[PDB]
């Protein structure tokens, strides 16, 4: 026989298709649906968060005078914000490719929910910010950490601490690196010490969910229960809008896909949410 020569897009003729099938892309899990959502018709919000409150009020039987203590709060304001994300498309590309319009829409929707997650976890309140998970949490106690041989053993240890306090827990909001690495763990020669002894679990352990979120500050795990800690007032729900006369459509034959939402996010108190950082 005799070799054949390869030429791009050649060897018969019959294509009436190019690219098909949904495409995966790097993402991470969200924690946003877990909390409460409520509608609002206001213009802005003021919330209260608790500062330190004492204890005791001892009787005149230890010859002490009763405490007339008054609980304290500091106030937070959140103005309305917009979270949004865009996809930019050429009509020609969308026609020739074939699924692309359907896919572009799923992609714009997933992109906005991702930018939403980003904000909710990591960022300190500026002015253009709402209430963010990483701010509200309680600071790490090094005491809770002790000598381990596994990433999984620390992770079990953080979770239990919250229960002692009588905090609320429902879910683990962890660093992407930390959650995974915790699943992956070894005894020094293999066997995970946070998942079963022949089976792997990455969905739910202890009977609570695990959320792995990227951007939340390196190697930290947070027990909390989302429903109590935050609430999302929604001035207007998610909607796509498209404009062929906008900044970018004018220059080059394009369509602009905008997908937006107007939110506010309220963070009640500093408590019922604890963060612990790994052993020295």
């Amino acid at each position: 026989m005799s070799q054949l020569s390869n030429q791009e897009k050649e060897y018969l003729i019959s294509k009436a298709l190019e690219t098909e099938e949904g495409r995966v892309a790097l993402a991470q899990a969200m924690a946003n649906p877990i909390r409460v959502s409520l509608d609002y018709q206001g213009v802005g919000r003021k919330l209260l968060v608790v500062d330190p409150l004492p204890q005791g009020a001892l009787p005149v039987y230890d010859k002490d005078v009763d405490a007339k203590a008054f609980v304290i709060s500091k106030r937070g304001q959140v103005p309305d914000q917009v979270i949004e994300g865009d996809r930019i498309q050429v009509p020609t590309f969308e026609i020739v490719s074939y699924p692309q319009v359907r896919f572009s829409q799923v992609k714009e929707r997933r992109f906005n929910v991702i930018d939403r997650a980003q904000q909710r976890a990591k960022a300190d309140i500026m002015a253009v910010e709402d209430a963010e998970i990483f701010s509200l949490l309680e600071g790490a106690a090094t005491a809770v950490n002790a000598v381990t041989i596994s990433s999984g053993g620390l992770q079990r240890a953080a979770l239990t601490k919250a229960f002692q306090e009588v905090e609320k827990h429902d879910l683990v909001v962890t660093k992407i690196v930390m959650n995974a690495s915790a699943f992956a763990d070894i005894r020094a020669w293999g066997q995970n010490e946070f998942d079963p002894v022949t089976q792997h679990e990455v969905l739910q352990t202890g009977l609570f969910g695990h959320i792995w979120t990227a951007d939340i500050l390196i190697s930290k795990k947070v027990p909390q229960n989302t429903v109590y800690v935050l609430a999302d007032p929604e001035f207007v729900g998610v909607m796509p809008i498209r404009q062929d006369i906008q900044v970018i459509p004018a220059d080059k034959p394009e369509e602009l896909r905008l997908g937006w939402v107007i939110y506010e996010e309220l963070g009640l108190a500093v408590v019922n949410s604890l963060a612990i950082a790994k052993i020295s």
């Binding site: 050429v90 590309f93 970018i248 004018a250 220059d251």
Partner: protein, 150 residues
């Protein structure tokens, strides 16, 4: 118009061509700008919407990358650094510009203080070094019209 005489990049273009740069009447590139319309502007203006990275048309003219979200310029890295480049009425687009490949500025919107490339249809995106072009590490300011380049 004969205005725009002497070595101006700060009143030439609609946006800065350079503010700390310099070039003479020395042609180290005699190529035209087919970026920035004239015919509804001054002949001291070019009307340039990017002076950054360029890509060559058919013929011997350079202009801005009008590229989408799934298109991009390959090579042909030039940056525009002209002041007046061998004119007597002030450079206008369709008249001579002298380019370099290390000049300034490099337009960027983004949120700034980061690398930027040009894909300018109103679309700006950042640099990388294996995904998108290697600017060499620089800080380029937010919003086009004023860019201090490192």
């Amino acid at each position: 118009p004969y205005v725009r005489l002497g070595y101006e990049g700060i009143l030439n273009g609609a946006h800065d061509i350079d503010v700390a740069g310099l070039n003479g009447v020395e042609q180290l590139a005699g190529k035209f700008a087919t970026i920035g319309a004239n015919g509804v502007k001054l002949a001291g203006d070019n009307g340039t919407n990017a002076v950054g990275l360029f890509r060559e048309d058919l013929g011997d003219m350079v202009n801005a990358s009008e590229k989408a979200s799934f298109y991009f310029r390959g090579g042909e890295y030039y940056v525009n650094i002209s002041r007046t480049s061998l004119t007597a009425a002030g450079i206008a687009a369709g008249d001579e510009i002298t380019c370099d490949a290390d000049g300034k500025m490099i337009k960027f919107t983004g949120t700034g203080k980061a690398l930027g490339v040009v894909t300018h249809v109103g679309e700006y995106r950042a640099g990388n070094m294996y995904e998108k072009a290697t600017q060499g590490v620089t800080d380029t300011d937010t919003f086009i019209g004023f860019i201090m380049y490192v």
